Amino acid sequence: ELPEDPKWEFPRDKLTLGKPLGEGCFGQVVMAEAVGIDKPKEAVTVAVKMLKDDATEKDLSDLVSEMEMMKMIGKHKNIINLLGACTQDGPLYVIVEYASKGNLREYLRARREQMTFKDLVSCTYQLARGMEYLASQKCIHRDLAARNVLVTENNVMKIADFGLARDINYKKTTNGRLPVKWMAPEALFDRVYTHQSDVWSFGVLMWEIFTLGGSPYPGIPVEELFKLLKEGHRMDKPANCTNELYMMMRDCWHAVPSQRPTFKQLVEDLDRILTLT
Amino acid sequence: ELPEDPKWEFPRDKLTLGKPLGEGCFGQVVMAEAVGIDKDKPKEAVTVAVKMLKDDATEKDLSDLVSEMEMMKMIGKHKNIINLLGACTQDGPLYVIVEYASKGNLREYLRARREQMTFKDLVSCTYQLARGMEYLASQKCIHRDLAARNVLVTENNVMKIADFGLARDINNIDYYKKTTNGRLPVKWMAPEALFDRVYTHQSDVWSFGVLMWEIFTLGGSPYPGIPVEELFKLLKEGHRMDKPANCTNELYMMMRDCWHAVPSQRPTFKQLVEDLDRILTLT
Amino acid sequence: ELPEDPKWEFPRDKLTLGKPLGEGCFGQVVMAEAVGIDKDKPKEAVTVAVKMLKDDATEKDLSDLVSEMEMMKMIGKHKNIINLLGACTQDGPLYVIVEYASKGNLREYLRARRPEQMTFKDLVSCTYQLARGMEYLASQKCIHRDLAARNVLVTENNVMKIADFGLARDINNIDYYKKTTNGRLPVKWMAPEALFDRVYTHQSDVWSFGVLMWEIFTLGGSPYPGIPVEELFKLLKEGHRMDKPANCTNELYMMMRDCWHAVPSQRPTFKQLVEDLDRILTLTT
Amino acid sequence: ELPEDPKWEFPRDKLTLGKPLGEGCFGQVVMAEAVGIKPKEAVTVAVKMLKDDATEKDLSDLVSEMEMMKMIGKHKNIINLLGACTQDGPLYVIVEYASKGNLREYLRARRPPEQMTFKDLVSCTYQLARGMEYLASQKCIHRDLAARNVLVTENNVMKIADFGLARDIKKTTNGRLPVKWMAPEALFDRVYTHQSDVWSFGVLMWEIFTLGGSPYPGIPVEELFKLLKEGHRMDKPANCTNELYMMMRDCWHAVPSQRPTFKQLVEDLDRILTL
Ligand SMILES: Cc1[nH]nc2c1N=C(c1ccccc1Cl)c1cnc(N3CCOCC3)cc1N2
Ligand SMILES: Cc1[nH]nc2c1N=C(c1ccccc1Cl)c1cnc(N3CCOCC3)cc1N2
Ligand SMILES: Cc1[nH]nc2c1N=C(c1ccccc1Cl)c1cnc(N3CCOCC3)cc1N2
Ligand SMILES: Cc1[nH]nc2c1N=C(c1ccccc1Cl)c1cnc(N3CCOCC3)cc1N2
Ligand SMILES: [Cl-]
């Protein structure tokens, strides 16, 4: 039923299972070592993303689309790479890179052995760079939340959850099935997405980073949240982040999409900060 | 955002917060004692289940919860379907107040009894989940998600259907293929919904057959040993799950009947209510 | 060596072959004149077209004819459908004879007369004959799976006749006929349920009939114009349906849309199509 | 929708659509100017594409045909793949263009009542013969060898074509191949052998020597099996020299081991051209 790209395909037999990394509602993945993925005969360890016993058709449609999305994006230091994809006789298995420390939100939450401010800027800098590569490839993430951004072993940040991604190169969905708190007003109300919306989500992502994994829009119910955005309630600055970042961070959250800064602008703005810290 | 249902609204202050009865991936429900709701105008506390969106939320998830409140008001009351005691639409975050089932949901109700359950008792639940469906489909609605995991058993064991938020009104046009197929789990879905993208009343009966399978083989997963990806390939082939152990052939023939390839020829929901009534009567 | 059917047999000596009329992937038909083939008109030569194996013969083709011949025996005579007149089944080559329509297959014939002259009433009238023809098949519990405009032969004086019966199969006790999957059918004229669920029925035929009206209405135009077969599946799930032809009246177009309903239970059955068409037909003058 | 092989894929924009070049009931082939190939120049190619009446099974046959072509490689005397469009949009499989079409027609349109002489008739046989030789040792077999499925190349170079019914090396359905060109060994027991094609080749030789005349003239397909079951063999064509007639008999040998091997046939033919 599912055709196999020759370059991506990997034999089912070669791969070996490991203790499951996680079992989310979105998808199930099991850590595993796959040998000779590149053949160099190296038994690399790759997390595998796969379906649950009961899978929604949209999940089936989404994971497969997520696998396809990885092929288009070029290998980049920040975005999580796809090393090999399996579409054998058995159930579809996707092989991804393994990030030893888990997602960004959970990594900071476990460091409230300490996180110096320079590292926080560095963590922020890498995300901008990743988005910049995606912008060049015209891919829009649609999430950009700390909770699905894998931070790898030796602290190099990695973007993740490309299942929701679409290739940009307005009206295919109402921009539902996405976390509202991390979602842009333009997408929320008019159901269209653009690079700016990721930047707004990225603006929310910065609060996740600067609140040491803290949840955004504290004390506000999602139903209530529709109203504040129209009137302009933007969250106050996190303690650790310096004031200069806030003007940039707040600028990302804008009423009109055109005003919001593009990624090229953000990385360049961010590159200097690391230098003077 | 939210209007006013004078009969439906229940003030936030009257209802009391409680320990959570599970946190679903889609939404969170927390137990509550409803001071305000009146069994017969007592104004005495009655236990209840509050269903609320958890703060991290899907864009659709807010909509689905709102749809669930809207869907239930239209349905009315039947002894085989979950009640709809209250809503807190007027203020704060949406809170939906729905009656509580002591025994819990049917799928795990059966797994934990693999206690003693007589064969007929099992027929009774299957017979019952059929009476409820008949009323539900006689109100020009398609539940669209029938599965054991969503049939809730009350204390004293009276089966109540749940998760009504997904099902859509089919009153004058029968759910043409608008859907993008993210609506339902593949294992419990009908083939026409899976392939054609059309859902009719009959598709609940295809789903109902799997519900008969789950109930009959002690809350067991269907299409076991078969990956979802591979499932589609033999659905066209027509291979179907075999009769669960200790199930009478007559129920199995009824089960296979539900599994008819042609939606038009599947047993009508009235027939299912009618047969089981005869079947159950013998013993 | 096939078993003889006494009624169908037609002596080889009586039949004397004539020049060939087109070629197909199922074999070929050569015009022939058979003496007194039609009962109640004995000792007369009535032109007949004989379906015979192509010099190069597909094994499926040999089997195909045998099956095709069997279908003719069961359907029974009808003014609007091609009818078996006789058959050659004995020792030697197997010639199967079938009625000869002077004008030819309908889609091409229409393509003959796009501004010859064809008035709108004839186009509506022509559809009525096909709908009536289909009803007999529905009544006789058989389904013509490949019901498309190109295969409908129209006779001299326009008595439209159905054709290319090898695909159609009996449904005496089982309605779906779900066993056959993707063996040999056009995607564009296939119904949606059958294409995806591998089930065919009479409501399923009407969808093929639905398209057949469109081909006929726009002078034998190809169905689903400008859209490739490969990408047809995606639009079909989404609900795209071809637009009404410029020639078409609104009333016919609603029936066309009516014949394309997603749910088979909902589409009209052939009795309704013939009845609805008859009224529309009545007001033509 | 379909996995794209990087080597084979050719961008849709690059190849101008062009116009029709003959037709077949199963699929449609249309000539086109395909810029590029590693010439880096624009030259004509015939792309085979799904026809309007798309059979459900027809799509599978097209994919199999593309697959067959990929493994074979390139030979002088056999039509070989020139890359295919693949994943984006509609699927067109591209093959090399032949100028004069199928050989059977080419021979018919060269019957008197510069026509080919006897050496030219022999020359076609050698080419066709060597091509089977190239195909031979690839662990592949054509399964349908006849004049129509053989395509001449502008400037007279013969190329075997229409590779869909080939399975690179007996559970096959064996419904879709013609009775007359089928090997007796193959038709009756449904067995398929690399050298079972010599009979097909033996029949093919006959088409060339009578400039395309239909094989077993006067014998209907229905009655054909009986003659094959008993001892029988097509008559030697008038144009062909007697030495060839025996080759056909040798090619038609009752048991598969006995039919001359493709190297043998090709080697035997060379002497004849050489002589
Ligand atoms: C797909 C993928 N690729 N790489 C991954 C990974 N998934 C996650 C993950 C975490 C929570 C929820 C969902 C998921 Cl999918 C992950 C989790 N825990 C890791 N850790 C092991 C060692 O110690 C700390 C914990 C590592 C991970 N990395
Ligand atoms: C919406 C609703 N209405 N009524 C409900 C209820 N939700 C559930 C539930 C069950 C499975 C998955 C999700 C959910 Cl939300 C529930 C769970 N467990 C119960 N039991 C308490 C006492 O101990 C045994 C267990 C009772 C429940 N009742
Ligand atoms: C089986 C049969 N029965 N009757 C037939 C007939 N076959 C055909 C035919 C047509 C299209 C495709 C396939 C076929 Cl087989 C036919 C063709 N051409 C005719 N005409 C000759 C004189 O010029 C005008 C045209 C007449 C025909 N009649
Ligand atoms: C695969 C391929 N490669 N090259 C091809 C070609 N297909 C054919 C062909 C022939 C018979 C049956 C099927 C087919 Cl598909 C072809 C036919 N006729 C040509 N002629 C053009 C000029 O006028 C006389 C006719 C040219 C052709 N070229
Ligand atoms: Cl139906």
Coordinates of C-alpha atoms in Angstrom, one line a residue, chain B:
Chain B
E1 CA -18.0 32.9 22.9
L2 CA -20.6 31.1 25.1
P3 CA -24.3 32.1 25.2
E4 CA -26.9 31.4 27.9
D5 CA -29.0 28.2 28.4
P6 CA -31.1 29.1 31.2
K7 CA -32.1 25.5 32.0
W8 CA -28.6 24.2 31.4
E9 CA -26.4 26.7 33.3
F10 CA -25.3 25.7 36.8
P11 CA -23.4 28.4 38.7
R12 CA -19.7 27.8 39.4
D13 CA -20.0 28.5 43.1
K14 CA -22.6 25.8 43.8
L15 CA -20.4 23.0 42.3
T16 CA -17.5 21.6 44.4
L17 CA -14.1 20.7 43.1
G18 CA -12.9 17.1 43.6
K19 CA -10.3 14.5 42.8
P20 CA -9.9 13.8 39.1
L21 CA -11.5 10.8 37.5
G22 CA -8.7 10.2 35.0
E23 CA -7.0 12.6 32.6
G24 CA -7.7 11.8 29.0
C25 CA -5.3 12.7 26.3
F26 CA -8.0 14.8 24.6
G27 CA -9.6 16.3 27.7
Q28 CA -9.7 16.1 31.5
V29 CA -12.5 15.2 33.7
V30 CA -12.6 15.8 37.4
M31 CA -15.1 14.4 39.9
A32 CA -17.4 16.9 41.6
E33 CA -20.3 17.2 44.0
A34 CA -23.0 19.3 42.5
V35 CA -24.8 21.3 45.1
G36 CA -27.3 22.9 42.8
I37 CA -28.6 20.1 40.5
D38 CA -32.0 18.9 41.6
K39 CA -32.9 15.2 41.4
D40 CA -36.3 16.4 42.5
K41 CA -35.6 20.0 43.6
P42 CA -33.8 18.9 46.8
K43 CA -31.0 21.3 46.5
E44 CA -28.9 18.7 48.1
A45 CA -25.4 17.6 47.0
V46 CA -25.3 15.0 44.2
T47 CA -22.1 13.5 42.9
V48 CA -21.1 14.4 39.3
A49 CA -18.5 14.3 36.7
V50 CA -17.2 17.6 35.5
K51 CA -15.6 17.6 32.1
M52 CA -13.2 20.3 31.4
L53 CA -10.6 21.3 28.8
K54 CA -7.1 21.0 30.3
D55 CA -5.1 24.1 29.9
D56 CA -2.7 22.9 27.2
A57 CA -5.2 22.4 24.5
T58 CA -5.9 21.5 20.9
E59 CA -7.6 24.1 18.8
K60 CA -10.2 21.4 17.9
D61 CA -10.3 20.2 21.5
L62 CA -12.1 23.4 22.6
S63 CA -14.5 22.9 19.8
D64 CA -15.1 19.2 20.5
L65 CA -16.0 19.9 24.1
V66 CA -18.4 22.6 23.0
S67 CA -19.8 20.3 20.4
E68 CA -20.3 17.7 23.1
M69 CA -22.4 20.1 25.2
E70 CA -24.4 21.0 22.1
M71 CA -24.8 17.5 20.9
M72 CA -26.3 16.2 24.1
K73 CA -28.9 18.9 24.6
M74 CA -30.5 17.9 21.3
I75 CA -30.5 14.2 22.1
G76 CA -32.7 14.3 25.2
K77 CA -32.8 11.6 27.9
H78 CA -32.7 7.8 27.5
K79 CA -31.8 5.3 30.2
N80 CA -29.1 3.8 28.0
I81 CA -27.2 7.1 27.3
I82 CA -25.3 9.3 29.7
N83 CA -27.2 12.2 31.2
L84 CA -26.5 15.8 30.8
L85 CA -27.0 17.5 34.2
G86 CA -25.2 20.7 33.6
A87 CA -23.1 23.3 31.9
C88 CA -21.2 26.2 33.3
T89 CA -21.1 28.1 30.0
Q90 CA -21.8 31.5 31.3
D91 CA -18.6 32.2 33.3
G92 CA -15.0 31.4 33.3
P93 CA -13.6 28.3 31.5
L94 CA -16.1 25.9 30.1
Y95 CA -17.2 23.3 32.6
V96 CA -19.6 20.6 31.5
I97 CA -21.5 18.7 34.1
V98 CA -22.4 15.1 33.2
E99 CA -23.7 12.3 35.4
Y100 CA -21.3 9.9 37.0
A101 CA -20.9 6.2 36.5
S102 CA -19.7 4.4 39.7
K103 CA -18.8 1.1 38.0
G104 CA -16.9 3.0 35.3
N105 CA -16.5 2.5 31.5
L106 CA -17.4 -0.8 30.0
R107 CA -14.0 -1.7 28.3
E108 CA -12.1 -1.7 31.6
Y109 CA -15.2 -3.0 33.4
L110 CA -14.8 -6.2 31.5
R111 CA -11.0 -6.5 31.7
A112 CA -11.1 -6.3 35.5
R113 CA -13.5 -9.2 35.6
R114 CA -11.4 -11.6 33.6
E115 CA -15.4 -11.2 39.9
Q116 CA -17.9 -13.3 38.1
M117 CA -20.0 -12.5 35.0
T118 CA -22.7 -14.8 33.6
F119 CA -22.9 -15.3 30.0
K120 CA -26.2 -13.7 29.7
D121 CA -25.2 -10.7 31.7
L122 CA -22.8 -10.2 28.8
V123 CA -25.7 -10.4 26.4
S124 CA -27.6 -7.9 28.5
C125 CA -25.0 -5.3 28.0
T126 CA -24.8 -6.0 24.3
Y127 CA -28.5 -6.0 24.2
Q128 CA -28.6 -2.8 26.1
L129 CA -25.9 -0.9 24.1
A130 CA -28.3 -1.7 21.2
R131 CA -31.4 -0.2 22.8
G132 CA -29.5 3.0 23.5
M133 CA -28.1 3.1 20.0
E134 CA -31.6 2.7 18.6
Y135 CA -32.9 5.8 20.3
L136 CA -29.7 7.6 19.4
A137 CA -30.1 6.8 15.8
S138 CA -33.8 7.4 15.9
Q139 CA -33.1 11.0 16.8
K140 CA -31.4 11.5 13.4
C141 CA -27.9 11.3 14.8
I142 CA -24.8 9.3 14.3
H143 CA -22.7 8.8 17.4
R144 CA -19.7 8.1 15.1
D145 CA -17.5 6.7 17.8
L146 CA -19.1 3.6 19.3
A147 CA -16.6 1.5 21.1
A148 CA -16.6 -0.3 24.4
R149 CA -14.1 2.2 25.9
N150 CA -16.9 4.7 25.6
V151 CA -19.9 2.9 27.0
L152 CA -20.1 3.7 30.7
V153 CA -21.5 1.4 33.2
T154 CA -23.4 2.9 36.2
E155 CA -23.5 1.6 39.7
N156 CA -26.1 -1.3 39.6
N157 CA -24.9 -1.9 36.0
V158 CA -27.1 0.1 33.6
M159 CA -25.1 0.8 30.4
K160 CA -24.7 4.4 29.4
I161 CA -23.2 5.6 26.1
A162 CA -20.6 8.4 26.2
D163 CA -18.2 10.7 24.2
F164 CA -21.0 12.3 22.3
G165 CA -19.0 15.3 21.3
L166 CA -17.9 13.7 18.0
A167 CA -21.2 12.5 16.6
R168 CA -22.9 14.9 14.2
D169 CA -26.5 15.5 13.3
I170 CA -27.6 13.6 10.2
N171 CA -31.1 14.8 10.2
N172 CA -31.8 15.9 6.6
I173 CA -28.6 15.0 4.8
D174 CA -26.5 11.9 5.7
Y175 CA -23.0 13.1 6.5
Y176 CA -21.6 13.4 3.0
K177 CA -17.8 13.1 2.7
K178 CA -16.7 16.4 4.3
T179 CA -14.3 14.7 6.7
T180 CA -10.5 14.5 6.4
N181 CA -10.3 11.1 8.1
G182 CA -8.8 12.3 11.4
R183 CA -12.1 11.6 13.1
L184 CA -11.8 8.0 14.3
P185 CA -9.6 5.0 15.3
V186 CA -9.2 2.7 12.3
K187 CA -9.8 -0.5 14.1
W188 CA -13.4 0.4 15.2
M189 CA -14.2 2.3 12.0
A190 CA -16.5 1.3 9.2
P191 CA -15.1 0.7 5.8
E192 CA -17.2 3.3 4.0
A193 CA -16.1 5.9 6.4
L194 CA -12.5 4.7 6.1
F195 CA -12.6 4.6 2.3
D196 CA -15.6 6.4 0.8
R197 CA -15.5 9.1 3.6
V198 CA -19.3 8.8 4.0
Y199 CA -20.9 7.9 7.3
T200 CA -24.5 6.9 7.6
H201 CA -26.6 5.4 10.4
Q202 CA -25.5 2.0 9.3
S203 CA -21.8 2.7 10.0
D204 CA -22.6 2.8 13.7
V205 CA -23.8 -0.8 13.2
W206 CA -20.4 -1.7 11.7
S207 CA -18.8 0.0 14.7
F208 CA -21.4 -1.8 16.9
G209 CA -20.2 -5.2 15.7
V210 CA -16.7 -4.4 17.0
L211 CA -18.5 -3.3 20.2
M212 CA -20.2 -6.8 20.2
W213 CA -16.7 -8.3 19.8
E214 CA -15.2 -6.2 22.6
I215 CA -18.0 -7.0 25.0
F216 CA -18.1 -10.6 24.1
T217 CA -14.4 -11.5 24.4
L218 CA -13.9 -9.6 27.7
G219 CA -12.9 -6.2 26.6
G220 CA -10.3 -7.3 24.2
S221 CA -8.6 -5.4 21.4
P222 CA -10.0 -6.0 17.9
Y223 CA -7.9 -6.9 14.9
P224 CA -5.3 -8.2 17.3
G225 CA -1.9 -9.1 15.9
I226 CA -2.7 -6.9 12.9
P227 CA -1.0 -3.5 12.5
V228 CA -3.2 -0.6 11.5
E229 CA -1.3 -0.1 8.2
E230 CA -1.9 -3.7 7.2
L231 CA -5.5 -3.6 8.3
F232 CA -6.7 -1.7 5.2
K233 CA -5.3 -4.2 2.8
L234 CA -7.5 -7.0 4.0
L235 CA -10.6 -5.0 4.7
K236 CA -11.1 -4.9 0.9
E237 CA -10.2 -8.6 1.0
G238 CA -13.0 -9.0 3.5
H239 CA -11.1 -11.0 6.1
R240 CA -12.8 -10.5 9.5
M241 CA -12.0 -11.3 13.1
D242 CA -13.0 -14.7 14.2
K243 CA -15.6 -15.5 16.8
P244 CA -14.4 -15.0 20.3
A245 CA -14.2 -18.0 22.5
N246 CA -17.4 -18.8 24.4
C247 CA -19.7 -16.8 22.2
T248 CA -22.8 -18.6 20.8
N249 CA -23.0 -18.9 17.0
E250 CA -26.2 -16.9 16.9
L251 CA -24.5 -13.9 18.4
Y252 CA -21.6 -14.5 16.0
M253 CA -23.9 -14.7 13.0
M254 CA -25.4 -11.4 14.2
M255 CA -21.9 -10.1 14.6
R256 CA -20.9 -11.1 11.0
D257 CA -24.2 -9.6 9.9
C258 CA -23.1 -6.2 11.3
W259 CA -19.9 -6.6 9.4
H260 CA -21.6 -6.7 6.0
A261 CA -19.6 -5.1 3.2
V262 CA -22.7 -3.2 2.0
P263 CA -23.9 -0.5 4.4
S264 CA -27.5 -0.7 3.0
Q265 CA -27.8 -4.4 3.9
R266 CA -26.3 -4.2 7.4
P267 CA -28.8 -5.0 10.1
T268 CA -30.9 -2.0 11.0
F269 CA -30.5 -0.6 14.5
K270 CA -34.2 -1.5 15.1
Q271 CA -33.4 -5.1 14.0
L272 CA -30.5 -5.3 16.5
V273 CA -32.8 -4.1 19.2
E274 CA -35.5 -6.5 18.0
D275 CA -33.3 -9.7 17.7
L276 CA -31.4 -9.5 20.9
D277 CA -34.8 -9.1 22.6
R278 CA -35.7 -12.5 21.2
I279 CA -32.3 -13.9 21.9
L280 CA -32.1 -12.7 25.4
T281 CA -35.6 -14.0 26.1
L282 CA -34.7 -17.6 25.8
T283 CA -32.5 -17.7 28.9

